[PDB]
Amino acid sequence: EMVETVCGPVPVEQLGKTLIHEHFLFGYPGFQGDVTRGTFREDESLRVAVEAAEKMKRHGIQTVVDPTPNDCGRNPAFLRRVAEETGLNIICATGYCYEGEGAPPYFQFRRLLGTAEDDIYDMFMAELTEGIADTGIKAGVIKLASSKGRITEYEKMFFRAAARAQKETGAVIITHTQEGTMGPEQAAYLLEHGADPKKIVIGHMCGNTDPDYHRKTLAYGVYIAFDRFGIQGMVGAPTDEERVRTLLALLRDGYEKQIMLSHNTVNVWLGRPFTLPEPFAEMMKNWHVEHLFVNIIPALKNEGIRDEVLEQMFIGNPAALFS
Amino acid sequence: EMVETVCGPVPVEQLGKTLIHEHFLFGYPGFQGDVTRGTFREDESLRVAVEAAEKMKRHGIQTVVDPTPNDCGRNPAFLRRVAEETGLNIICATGYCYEGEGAPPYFQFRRLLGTAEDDIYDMFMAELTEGIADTGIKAGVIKLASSKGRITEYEKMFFRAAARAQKETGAVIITHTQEGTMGPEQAAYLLEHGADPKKIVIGHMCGNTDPDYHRKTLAYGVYIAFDRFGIQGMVGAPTDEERVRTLLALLRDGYEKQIMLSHNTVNVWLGRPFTLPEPFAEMMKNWHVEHLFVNIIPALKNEGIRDEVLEQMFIGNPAALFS
Numbered sequence A, B: 001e002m003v004e005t006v007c008g009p010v011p012v013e014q015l016g017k018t019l020i021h022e023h024f025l026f027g028y029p030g031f032q033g034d035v036t037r038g039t040f041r042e043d044e045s046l047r048v049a050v051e052a053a054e055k056m057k058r059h060g061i062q063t064v065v066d067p068t069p070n071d072c073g074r075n076p077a078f079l080r081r082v083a084e085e086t087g088l089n090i091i092c093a094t095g096y097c098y099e100g101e102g103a104p105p106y107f108q109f110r111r112l113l114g115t116a117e118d119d120i121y122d123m124f125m126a127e128l129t130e131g132i133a134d135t136g137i138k139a140g141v142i143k144l145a146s147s148k149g150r151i152t153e154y155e156k157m158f159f160r161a162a163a164r165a166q167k168e169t170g171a172v173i174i175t176h177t178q179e180g181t182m183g184p185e186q187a188a189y190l191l192e193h194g195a196d197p198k199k200i201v202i203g204h205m206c207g208n209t210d211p212d213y214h215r216k217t218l219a220y221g222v223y224i225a226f227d228r229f230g231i232q233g234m235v236g237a238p239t240d241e242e243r244v245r246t247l248l249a250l251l252r253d254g255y256e257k258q259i260m261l262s263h264n265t266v267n268v269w270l271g272r273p274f275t276l277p278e279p280f281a282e283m284m285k286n287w288h289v290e291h292l293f294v295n296i297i298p299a300l301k302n303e304g305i306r307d308e309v310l311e312q313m314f315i316g317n318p319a320a321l322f323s
């Protein structure tokens, strides 16, 4: 009936139209060491995050899942200030980034101690049921991530702890796949350890342009997310035109009850400000929270996708996922 | 004539007896994501660090260089509290850990922007000449580190930025070597880029037991540090007996004006508390700040090392290094 948000429990039936994957804050691990030249300006960051929440509200969004990993600048008290300023429901996560771009030294060391998987499970349970730090905010999802072409031994510790925690709590699992790989393997691995496919979203599936790969993942009964609309030319990503082509193939095959859409925006960057060089800057110009509603959804409608199917992806699927 | 400490400038002639490499706080990258179960307990941490400082003071130590990297939990404000409570001179560092167990994702991304080396130089210069974050504290050394068997292209960016910053400021460079490798390569690369060997300490040289490797490094005119006394059977370390054997060969060759000694202790660990499993726990039992003075130094004297040589390593060499 309920899901934990940054403002406490909200009835699932009230989530409404939802973006399954956006970041209000995000930092690449190591941003903390650039604090002198990259200090966190709370007021301007809150202003920029509140504006991003406003743009989402302008298109009917009532709920955002922000799955920023623990080691990438997750800040639940900050998310709570965005939610209270805007009325947006925000669901945050507990979990670590994948080994390639995460901060693995700490839990790699706890492997040596022999307690890592159990420590991670303990962290998951505490943040799902008690609260994150002293904020009193519980995560509503477990975030998992794997590397390109491989679910590493480090990553598999988190996958096994997440399956253990889901059995105890019923929590939703959201994943990150790297460069269109390991979607089927992630689903198989979680299910083999007892995870509920109806409570799993395999993320970044738009990174693969082969519908056979998607159908193989969807056969496990899980949700998949085309959650990187607007990201072109970077992190190995395909174009939006390719995303739409792949998505249309699945929707015309009747998979609408298993698909959700998002942008994976980073609305405030942690660390030192930057500007993208001119090759990437142009390719990335549609990477913002209005892109699905101004550009992508109209293109899907012009391809014949009906309102009922869009409502299933944005409203029905997140309601079913969290209940 | 001055060096920056966590309390401000101190005359170099007043540093006195020095430990060149100890950590009051330290955390493996990723400890920040374990905040719920691994919160920082300042008071007990300050008490533990202060008791560590008081044990050092009982053996004559007046100054400690704490080179905790920026991405490993460096906390200059905390160090100032240890220094104010105890009267110890504490010199802190600016720098990042090596790629293998550091947090490279952030400055790896800035290499894509094409600004990484220049941003790191800017960070070094700000923290050496302006202040760290809003603490008003300046670093007194630049910390560099390389991986096992390689100075990676990521690491080389910091080496080049450090050489550039040293030319501007005259700041001392302290390095980490991994598992007894890259000593000569570090000295050669730094000198290639204009660094001053009289201002460089190649660290963890005790990780290599071949005196020819040390002599190869010493030929560059740099200092070397036997700075991991007490660490046995972890991170590839040799035994203290092997350290003493290597050190004795070098001292009998007349190298005392290039050698400094330390433990590389970690007196308060960041993140979740732990206890070492019992194979490592026994090998590591002498890893504390009194080990050099209770065990190692008496063993050196029994092998004929004179007080004048010990005073050169602990007092004369730090004074020459920082002036």
Ligand SMILES: [Fe+3]
Pocket: A021, A023, A067, A264
């Ligand atoms: Fe994301």
Ligand SMILES: [Fe+3]
Pocket: B021, B023, B067, B264
């Ligand atoms: Fe160290």
Ligand SMILES: [O-]
Pocket: A176, A264
């Ligand atoms: O992501």
Ligand SMILES: [O-]
Pocket: B176, B264
């Ligand atoms: O170290």
Ligand SMILES: [Zn+2]
Pocket: A175, A176, A177, A203, A204
């Ligand atoms: Zn992701």
Ligand SMILES: [Zn+2]
Pocket: B175, B176, B177, B203, B204
């Ligand atoms: Zn080191």
